[PDB]
Design an enzyme around this catalytic site. Sequence first.
Site, PDB file in Angstrom:
ATOM      1  N   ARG A 177       0.842  -1.362  -0.076  1.00  0.00           N
ATOM      2  CA  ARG A 177      -0.002  -0.043  -0.031  1.00  0.00           C
ATOM      3  C   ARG A 177       0.825   1.250   0.065  1.00  0.00           C
ATOM      4  O   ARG A 177       0.912   2.153   0.943  1.00  0.00           O
ATOM      5  CB  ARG A 177      -0.840   0.032   1.175  1.00  0.00           C
ATOM      6  N   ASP A 242       2.674  -8.027   7.273  1.00  0.00           N
ATOM      7  CA  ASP A 242       1.678  -7.211   6.608  1.00  0.00           C
ATOM      8  C   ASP A 242       0.336  -8.196   6.099  1.00  0.00           C
ATOM      9  O   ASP A 242      -0.118  -7.694   4.997  1.00  0.00           O
ATOM     10  CB  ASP A 242       2.139  -6.544   5.202  1.00  0.00           C
ATOM     11  N   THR A 243       0.000  -9.231   6.904  1.00  0.00           N
ATOM     12  CA  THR A 243      -1.001 -10.168   6.542  1.00  0.00           C
ATOM     13  C   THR A 243      -1.800 -10.385   7.596  1.00  0.00           C
ATOM     14  O   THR A 243      -2.897  -9.539   7.631  1.00  0.00           O
ATOM     15  CB  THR A 243      -0.318 -11.394   6.049  1.00  0.00           C
ATOM     16  N   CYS A 348      -0.561 -20.524   0.282  1.00  0.00           N
ATOM     17  CA  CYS A 348       0.138 -19.704   1.480  1.00  0.00           C
ATOM     18  C   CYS A 348       0.585 -20.825   2.418  1.00  0.00           C
ATOM     19  O   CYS A 348       0.193 -21.618   2.775  1.00  0.00           O
ATOM     20  CB  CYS A 348      -0.664 -18.872   2.316  1.00  0.00           C
ATOM     21  N   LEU A 349       1.989 -20.594   2.698  1.00  0.00           N
ATOM     22  CA  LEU A 349       2.903 -21.538   3.333  1.00  0.00           C
ATOM     23  C   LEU A 349       2.835 -21.022   4.925  1.00  0.00           C
ATOM     24  O   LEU A 349       3.397 -21.774   5.851  1.00  0.00           O
ATOM     25  CB  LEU A 349       4.553 -21.426   2.876  1.00  0.00           C
ATOM     26  N   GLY A 350       2.454 -19.754   5.228  1.00  0.00           N
ATOM     27  CA  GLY A 350       2.320 -19.341   6.540  1.00  0.00           C
ATOM     28  C   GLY A 350       0.662 -19.484   7.148  1.00  0.00           C
ATOM     29  O   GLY A 350       0.453 -18.788   8.074  1.00  0.00           O
TER      30      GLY A 350
HETATM   31  C1  HEM Z   1      -3.912 -13.603   7.110  1.00  0.00           C
HETATM   32  C2  HEM Z   1      -2.758 -14.039   6.806  1.00  0.00           C
HETATM   33  C3  HEM Z   1      -2.276 -14.360   5.326  1.00  0.00           C
HETATM   34  C4  HEM Z   1      -2.990 -14.448   4.315  1.00  0.00           C
HETATM   35  C5  HEM Z   1      -4.526 -13.980   3.753  1.00  0.00           C
HETATM   36  C6  HEM Z   1      -2.042 -15.056   3.282  1.00  0.00           C
HETATM   37  C7  HEM Z   1      -2.196 -15.073   1.794  1.00  0.00           C
HETATM   38  C8  HEM Z   1      -1.397 -15.557   0.927  1.00  0.00           C
HETATM   39  C9  HEM Z   1      -1.793 -15.710  -0.481  1.00  0.00           C
HETATM   40  C10 HEM Z   1      -2.844 -15.276  -1.211  1.00  0.00           C
HETATM   41  C11 HEM Z   1      -0.631 -16.173  -0.942  1.00  0.00           C
HETATM   42  C12 HEM Z   1      -0.493 -16.409  -2.521  1.00  0.00           C
HETATM   43  C13 HEM Z   1       0.154 -15.511  -3.289  1.00  0.00           C
HETATM   44  C14 HEM Z   1       0.306 -15.725  -5.030  1.00  0.00           C
HETATM   45  O1  HEM Z   1      -0.195 -16.817  -5.347  1.00  0.00           O
HETATM   46  O2  HEM Z   1       0.713 -14.811  -5.639  1.00  0.00           O
HETATM   47  C15 HEM Z   1       0.329 -16.363  -0.191  1.00  0.00           C
HETATM   48  C16 HEM Z   1       1.918 -17.047  -0.343  1.00  0.00           C
HETATM   49  C17 HEM Z   1       2.525 -17.218   0.645  1.00  0.00           C
HETATM   50  N1  HEM Z   1       2.517 -16.713   2.151  1.00  0.00           N
HETATM   51 FE1  HEM Z   1       0.788 -16.120   2.813  1.00  0.00          FE
HETATM   52  N2  HEM Z   1      -0.767 -15.220   3.740  1.00  0.00           N
HETATM   53  C18 HEM Z   1      -0.938 -14.864   5.162  1.00  0.00           C
HETATM   54  C19 HEM Z   1      -0.007 -14.919   6.075  1.00  0.00           C
HETATM   55  C20 HEM Z   1       1.378 -15.377   5.868  1.00  0.00           C
HETATM   56  C21 HEM Z   1       2.355 -15.464   6.916  1.00  0.00           C
HETATM   57  C22 HEM Z   1       2.243 -15.044   8.327  1.00  0.00           C
HETATM   58  C23 HEM Z   1       3.530 -16.157   6.294  1.00  0.00           C
HETATM   59  C24 HEM Z   1       4.750 -16.331   6.863  1.00  0.00           C
HETATM   60  C25 HEM Z   1       5.967 -15.531   6.899  1.00  0.00           C
HETATM   61  C26 HEM Z   1       3.234 -16.296   4.809  1.00  0.00           C
HETATM   62  C27 HEM Z   1       4.053 -16.945   4.143  1.00  0.00           C
HETATM   63  C28 HEM Z   1       3.769 -17.132   2.725  1.00  0.00           C
HETATM   64  C29 HEM Z   1       4.749 -17.456   1.751  1.00  0.00           C
HETATM   65  C30 HEM Z   1       6.108 -17.884   1.929  1.00  0.00           C
HETATM   66  C31 HEM Z   1       4.188 -17.518   0.609  1.00  0.00           C
HETATM   67  C32 HEM Z   1       4.621 -17.874  -1.028  1.00  0.00           C
HETATM   68  C33 HEM Z   1       4.242 -19.427  -1.397  1.00  0.00           C
HETATM   69  C34 HEM Z   1       4.747 -19.511  -2.914  1.00  0.00           C
HETATM   70  O3  HEM Z   1       4.886 -18.683  -3.497  1.00  0.00           O
HETATM   71  O4  HEM Z   1       4.906 -20.839  -3.236  1.00  0.00           O
HETATM   72  N3  HEM Z   1       1.993 -16.036   4.779  1.00  0.00           N
HETATM   73  N4  HEM Z   1       0.013 -16.078   1.287  1.00  0.00           N
HETATM   74  C1  LIG Z   2       0.310 -11.494  -1.659  1.00  0.00           C
HETATM   75  C2  LIG Z   2       1.250 -11.857  -0.274  1.00  0.00           C
HETATM   76  C3  LIG Z   2       0.097 -11.749   0.636  1.00  0.00           C
HETATM   77  C4  LIG Z   2       1.974 -13.244  -0.354  1.00  0.00           C
HETATM   78  C5  LIG Z   2       2.698 -13.339   1.008  1.00  0.00           C
HETATM   79  C6  LIG Z   2       3.108 -11.829   1.285  1.00  0.00           C
HETATM   80  C7  LIG Z   2       2.598 -11.187  -0.163  1.00  0.00           C
HETATM   81  C8  LIG Z   2       2.464  -9.735  -0.133  1.00  0.00           C
HETATM   82  C9  LIG Z   2       3.529 -11.539  -1.507  1.00  0.00           C
HETATM   83  O1  LIG Z   2       4.306 -10.856  -1.836  1.00  0.00           O
HETATM   84  C10 LIG Z   2       3.140 -13.106  -1.478  1.00  0.00           C
END
Ligand code: HEM
Ligand SMILES: CC1(C)[C@@H]2CC[C@@]1(C)C(=O)C2
Length: 405
Positions: A177, A242-243, A348-350
């Site tokens: 943002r 930022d999630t 999402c891995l987190g």
């Molecule tokens: C409310 C919390 C969260 C939401 C809604 C969320 C949502 C997402 C979404 C929609 C993607 C897919 C992006 C794409 O396909 O371009 C993603 C990927 C990912 N997220 Fe989250 N996320 C959250 C929290 C977290 C947290 C706390 C972590 C740990 C730091 C995390 C780590 C990752 C990683 C490492 C990926 C990449 C997976 C890949 O590209 O193979 N996320 N997340």
């Molecule tokens: C779209 C996301 C929510 C996902 C984890 C952090 C984020 C901003 C990325 O760049 C991949």
Amino acid sequence: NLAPLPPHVPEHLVFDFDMYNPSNLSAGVQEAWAVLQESNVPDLVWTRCNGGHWIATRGQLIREAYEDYRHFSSECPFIPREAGEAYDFIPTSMDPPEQRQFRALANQVVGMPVVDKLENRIQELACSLIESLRPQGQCNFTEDYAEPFPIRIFMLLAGLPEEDIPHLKYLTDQMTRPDGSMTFAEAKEALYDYLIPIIEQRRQKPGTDAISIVANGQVNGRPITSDEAKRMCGLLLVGGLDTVVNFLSFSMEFLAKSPEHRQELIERPERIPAACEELLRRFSLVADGRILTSDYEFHGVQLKKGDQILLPQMLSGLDERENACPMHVDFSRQKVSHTTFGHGSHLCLGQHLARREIIVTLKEWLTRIPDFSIAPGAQIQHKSGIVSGVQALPLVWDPATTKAV
Ligand code: HEM
Ligand SMILES: CC1(C)[C@@H]2CC[C@@]1(C)C(=O)C2
Ligand SMILES: [K+]
């Protein structure tokens, strides 16, 4: 400003939606994006905003595109194009097959095993923060809990000093943002500037923190490179800062405005996990996309190689075609359909860490501060972008109605 319409885009598919400042933002950000799902709006539209790009407006198309990485590449996943081009985080900026090997390493630092490990510290921090606020009878939820809770947990996991939060949080926010003071590329470079010496130090003298694990890890049996480690750690920082931080505010704003839903979770705590899932659907907040790898006809629309397409993860669950009465919140909803945590090979891995943080928050907050409301005369304002959020969330409550324990 509106970008000139490309030669292959028909005027009847033009809907100038601005993902960084949607027209009906005042009604709520999810409501603002939902305007793309009104009767007269096509399944796939083109907006001249932010450089010009497509937008899939229905869950069916969003899911289909995220599944088809052959046509919809993650190489340039962010809008505007400059941001998409600069975006090189791992594994997100990669398509299978190369992408896969990196997911296992990322899972090592934010996966289930790690979550189960952090459980106690997560619970401890939630309780500590809430108990400190409880007697005050008021708080600025975004800065008093939504930010410190998930962020301090991540800094702990990554072995980074909490004094670095203001700087890192500012950079992270410029990538999702932007305030205008920094381009995505400048914010990314600043984040890498921060990480480079740390990664080098931990490759020389490994610790047990997430950065050390990633920097000294292996992918598909071979050593990860310094640059690869940097690109993965950058993504982890953004995910941790930022999630969940933003999602918690959407959830608490809702609970503050709906005593009935609060009472439900108070009387039947066993429903909190289900409530978490329904809230993840109703207050979904992410929206990134893909780039066309070739000319491709998708749902009767001619897409050209190079065209960017926004595939709002947020919209799938709000689609009436996926969930009846989508804007309504029901913790007993049968089949909660959504793509809040993504879809396809980039799931999402987190999400496990996220759900644990959300559930612990709902349980520990309702246990100590069961009755609270939006502060008198406050008008909650949302903000939109790659990840949407809440600008401020002033809450109030009578300390006499709280429980210390
Ligand atoms: C409310 C919390 C969260 C939401 C809604 C969320 C949502 C997402 C979404 C929609 C993607 C897919 C992006 C794409 O396909 O371009 C993603 C990927 C990912 N997220 Fe989250 N996320 C959250 C929290 C977290 C947290 C706390 C972590 C740990 C730091 C995390 C780590 C990752 C990683 C490492 C990926 C990449 C997976 C890949 O590209 O193979 N996320 N997340
Ligand atoms: C779209 C996301 C929510 C996902 C984890 C952090 C984020 C901003 C990325 O760049 C991949
Ligand atoms: K790129």
